[PDB]
Paper text:
An essential piece of the invasion machinery used by sporozoites and merozoites is the interaction between Apical Membrane Antigen 1 (AMA1) and an extracellular ß-hairpin loop in the C-terminal portion of Rhoptry Neck Protein 2 (RON2). The extracellular ß-hairpin loop near the C-terminus of RON2 can then interact with AMA1 by nestling into the hydrophobic groove of Domain 1 of AMA118. For the RON2-loop to properly engage with AMA1, a mobile loop of Domain 2 of AMA1 is displaced by the incoming ligand to reveal the entire hydrophobic groove. The hydrophobic RON2 binding groove is highly conserved across Pv clinical isolates (97.8% over 110 residues).
We obtained a 2.4 Å resolution structure of humAb 826827 bound to the PvAMA1 ectodomain with an Rwork/Rfree of 19.2% and 23.5%. A 1:1 complex is present in the asymmetric unit. Our structure shows that 826827 interacts with PvAMA1 residues of Domain 1 and the mobile loop of Domain 2. Five of the six complementarity-determining regions (CDR, namely: L1, L2, H1, H2, and H3) form direct contacts with PvAMA1 with a buried interaction surface of ~1392 Å2, with the CDR-H3 loop of 826827 contributing 70% of the buried surface area. The CDR-H3 loop of 826827 forms a disulfide bridged β-hairpin that binds to the hydrophobic groove on PvAMA1 Domain 1, which constitutes part of the RON2-loop receptor binding site. The mobile Domain 2 loop of PvAMA1 is contacted by residues of CDR-H3 and CDR-H1, forming one salt bridge and six hydrogen bonds that stabilize its position on Domain 1. One salt bridge between PvAMA1 Lys321 and humAb 826827 CDR-H3 Glu103 provides an anchoring and orientation point for the observed interaction between the two proteins. A major difference exists in our structure, where the mobile Domain 2 loop with residues 304–327 is visible while it is unstructured in the other PvAMA1 structures. While Akter et al. observed an open or semi-open conformation in their PfAMA1 structure complex with a cyclized RON2 peptide, our crystal structure clearly shows that in the presence of 826827, the Domain 2 loop of PvAMA1 is stabilized and remains bound to Domain 1, effectively blocking the RON2 binding site. Structural analysis of the two residues N130 (N 86.4%, K 13.9%) and N132 (D 52.9%, N 46.7%, G 0.5%) with the highest variability between PvAMA1 sequences are unlikely to disrupt humAb 826827 binding significantly as the interactions are either maintained (backbone interactions) or do not directly lie in the groove of the binding pocket.
Numbering used by the authors:
A (entry chain B): 1 to 231
B (entry chain A): 46 to 210, 216 to 295, 304 to 327, 335 to 401, 416 to 474
C (entry chain C): 1 to 214
């Protein structure tokens, strides 16, 4: 039942230290053959391994970040952590924790890798390096109507406006409604705030047969809003 | 006159067939050493001699046990026992690459091919057990000149009721004809195995027991039909010294590529130390294989017989009996009218029977044996050569 | 470091077709190579390790091959759910110094599909504050290239609108687009008709959904 959970998304001020924890459930961080590592992905970009920690206490690090990286493991709480110091905007990324299948073999003063791949990953936590402070969004309904009706389908949604930083979680009916849902990438406005829309299309013959609650969660500001979208 | 000291001219020659002392671990199943790796307990091969022609037959499978272990989304039976071939520097490695890799090590370059493969395989430490006794066994392929490292140490899974009369991993050690050129190597195999260990079968020869100046038949032996030397060598391998004591959870470990579960699979968490039915005399005329569990201490010269051990090559035969062994030693002991306690030679007069020496009809060396003399030792039960009572206190 | 280069950057194929993705190493790495599939908004998922060993639970249509410096991932019969970015990753040196390729985006070809257009007036809650946002939705169209033009009183607008596009849908392989026309409360109540005009290959003529305040 192995699952990894990164700590929540948020802000880090420039030059300060980014701090993350991964909580392992359905398994133990004291598992020979497995290292626990951090991998990051700047928006729209590729993957970069940061470093790992082993349950005995040893740790490998990406040699180009070694001076800024500290990992640790808590065998009692089944967690491992990452500390990245002196962050710049270049460190803004989604940070994944991941289990790594690791196995090396050494003879005559040289080691050779047999396995170092990532078989189970967390969900990722977006870290934004910025000096700005957080602002929670306003949530407005996108009401269904004739202007929102085309063929046998009707559209309704939620406008999640004027928030910083990313991300926001949008579900519908607490996760019960997934079919027909489109949550769009947020856009950055001139004000420096983000804005997002999430819409659901339903058959127009079933408009008044179900109620539609959009659930909006902006963890950086602990804003949790439920908004009924009424015809 | 005759020496009163006992003398065995075979002592050095016969050292390599003392499998208890020279090999010191199981032959058919070798699991003679214990090892802990990250608080888990393992058993691993430890015999000091190579086992020519041994492999692992996986029943209900055409896959060779030298194929890498099968992990991920395949079934266990789709693979073998070898290291996954992910890294050219680990396993498998050709002799040519072995030679290049260690070209700058003078001691490594003095090793023979088999010992080079063993040393390469056994030198690997796992990054997390740098203080562990666990080192992997290897199979060197003499035809392909290739060294295979074995990822797991298990050699037999034939016991569980699921291994009794198709989609389950059941396997056994064997000398299949496919394995003829293979050499099974534990971590401890001597680099000088060629001087110290069995390899070639001994033609015009059968194993015997030295009893006060003559090589004698082993009284307690088990007779088995055998069509040829290969079959006799396989029979005695099946009877040799052995260290052998949920499947779904084992299969999940392989699917999950779990190091601990794979490497500990089919091992229950005793030791033969080399004791067993390790030797056999093959009658090439009567097609009989005579296996026994007593260390032999000499050879009888017999043109109808080949002497084989469980460790020996399936078919290589050295035909040249050491015909000069008795004559050379009689001259060596003359340097100590003191004639040695040796009553067999190809030189009749060198013995000096009180009677006429008797020629051995099947001796290719034309040996003569002096049987009309006082004997001071005898063979008790279980093939035990003991000094007679009249001289026990005197010796 | 060892650099991994992936090719092509994007791959556009039809369901049922064979997709071959390339990964080259700047330097020989034997077979210490893994493959991953990353779907939008989700973490990567292990497909292959040891260059050709398929991970437990991965469908059999995925396979990898290669050694040294040349590697391939093959999807023997592309499914519409296979839309993702695929990454390779080497791990040859110990202590581990893994690196990833830059990724190959696999998109699914499908037939042209016209968008269904919807327009959303500003909500009365938003209008209590000083801002009005008008939302124009284009959902389930293909291909991805579309153009929306905001016309407030037959006057084309510029600089007051933003849009974003969803990634390809897992079942029908279409895209959706959302555009927001943001005016002040004052500017919004000065005019009456608000329209978004949409041009698309599947549209015979540009379609315009519109409304008047009231």
């Amino acid at each position: 039942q192995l699952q990894l959970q990164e700590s929540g998304p948020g802000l880090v001020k420039p030059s300060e230290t980014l701090s993350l924890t991964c909580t392992v459930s359905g398994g133990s961080v004291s598992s020979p053959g497995y290292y626990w590592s951090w991998i990051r992905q700047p928006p729209g970009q590729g993957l970069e391994w940061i470093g790992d920690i082993y349950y005995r206490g040893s740790s490998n690090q990406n040699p180009s970040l070694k001076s800024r990286v500290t990992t640790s493991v808590d065998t009692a709480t089944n967690q491992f952590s990452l500390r990245l110091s002196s962050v710049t905007a270049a460190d803004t990324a989604v940070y994944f924790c991941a289990r790594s299948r690791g196995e090396g073999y050494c003879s005559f003063g040289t080691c050779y890798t047999l396995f170092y791949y990532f078989d189970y990953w967390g969900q990722g936590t977006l870290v934004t390096v910025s000096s700005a402070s957080t602002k929670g969004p306003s949530v407005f309904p996108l009401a269904p109507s004739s202007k929102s009706t085309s063929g046998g389908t009707a559209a309704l949604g939620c406008l999640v406006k004027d928030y910083f930083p990313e991300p926001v979680t949008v579900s519908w009916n607490s996760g019960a409604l997934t079919s027909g849902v489109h949550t769009f990438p947020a856009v950055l406005q001139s004000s420096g705030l983000y804005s997002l829309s999430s819409v659901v299309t339903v058959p127009s013959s079933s408009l008044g047969t179900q109620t539609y609650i959009c659930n909006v969660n902006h963890k950086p500001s602990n804003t949790k809003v439920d908004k009924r979208v009424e015809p | 006159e005759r020496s009163t000291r006992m003398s065995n001219p075979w002592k050095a020659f016969m050292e390599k067939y003392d499998i208890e002392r020279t090999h010191s671990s199981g032959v058919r199943v070798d699991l003679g050493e214990d090892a802990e790796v990250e608080n888990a307990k393992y058993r691993i091969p430890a015999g000091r001699c190579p086992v020519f022609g041994k492999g692992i037959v996986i029943e209900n499978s055409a896959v060779s046990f030298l194929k890498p272990v099968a992990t991920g989304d395949q079934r266990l039976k789709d693979g073998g026992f070898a290291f996954p071939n992910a890294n050219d520097h680990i396993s498998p490695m050709t002799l040519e690459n072995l030679k290049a890799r260690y070209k700058d090590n003078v001691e490594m370059m003095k090793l023979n091919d088999i010992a080079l493969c063993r040393t390469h395989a056994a030198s690997f430490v796992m990054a997390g057990d740098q203080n562990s006794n666990y080192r992997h066994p290897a199979v060197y392929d003499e035809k392909e000149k290739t060294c295979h490292m074995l990822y797991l140490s298990a050699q037999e899974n034939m016991g569980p009721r699921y291994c009794s009369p198709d989609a389950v991993f059941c396997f056994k050690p064997d000398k299949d004809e496919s394995f003829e050129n293979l050499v099974y190597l534990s971590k401890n195999v001597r680099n000088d195995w060629d001087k110290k260990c069995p390899r070639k079968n001994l033609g015009n020869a059968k194993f015997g027991l030295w009893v006060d100046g003559n090589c004698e038949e082993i009284p307690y032996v088990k007779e088995v039909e055998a069509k040829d030397l290969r079959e006799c060598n396989r029979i005695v391998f099946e009877a040799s010294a052995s260290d052998q004591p949920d499947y779904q959870k084992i299969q999940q470990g392989f699917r999950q590529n779990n190091r601990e579960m794979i490497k500990s699979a089919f091992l229950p968490v005793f030791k033969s130390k080399g004791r067993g039915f390790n030797w056999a005399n093959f009658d090439s005329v009567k097609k009989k294989c005579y296996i026994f569990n007593t260390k032999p201490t000499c050879l009888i010269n017999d043109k109808n017989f080949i002497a084989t051990t469980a460790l020996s090559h399936p078919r290589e035969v050295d035909l040249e009996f050491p015909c000069s062994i008795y004559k050379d030693e009689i001259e060596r002991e003359i340097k100590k009218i003191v004639l040695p306690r040796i009553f067999i030679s190809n030189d009749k007069e060198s013995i000096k029977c009180p009677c006429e020496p008797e020629h051995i009809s099947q001796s290719t060396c034309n040996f003569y044996v002096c049987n009309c003399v006082e004997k001071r030792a005898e063979i008790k039960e279980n093939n035990q050569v003991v000094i007679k009572e009249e001289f026990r206190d005197y010796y | 470091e060892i650099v991994m280069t992936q090719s092509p950057a994007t791959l556009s194929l039809s369901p049922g077709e064979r997709a071959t993705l390339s990964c080259r190493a700047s330097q020989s790495i034997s077979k210490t190579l893994a493959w991953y599939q990353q779907k939008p908004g989700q973490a990567p998922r292990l497909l292959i390790y040891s260059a050709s060993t398929r991970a437990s639970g991965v469908p059999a249509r995925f396979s990898g091959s290669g050694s040294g410096t040349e590697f391939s991932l093959t999807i023997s019969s592309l499914q519409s759910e296979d839309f993702a970015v695929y990454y390779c990753q080497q791990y040859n040196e110990w202590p581990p110094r893994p690196t990833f390729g830059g990724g190959t985006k696999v998109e699914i070809k499908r037939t042209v599909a016209a968008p269904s257009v919807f327009i959303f007036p500003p909500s009365d809650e938003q209008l209590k504050s000083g801002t009005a946002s008008v939302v124009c939705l284009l959902n389930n169209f293909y291909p991805r290239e579309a153009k929306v033009q905001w016309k407030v009183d037959n006057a084309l607008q510029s600089g007051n609108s933003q849009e974003s596009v969803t990634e390809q849908d897992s079942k029908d392989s279409t895209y959706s687009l959302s555009s927001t026309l943001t005016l002040s409360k004052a500017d919004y109540e000065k005019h009456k008709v608000y329209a978004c005009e949409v041009t698309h290959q599947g549209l015979s003529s540009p379609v315009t959904k519109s409304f008047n305040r009231g």
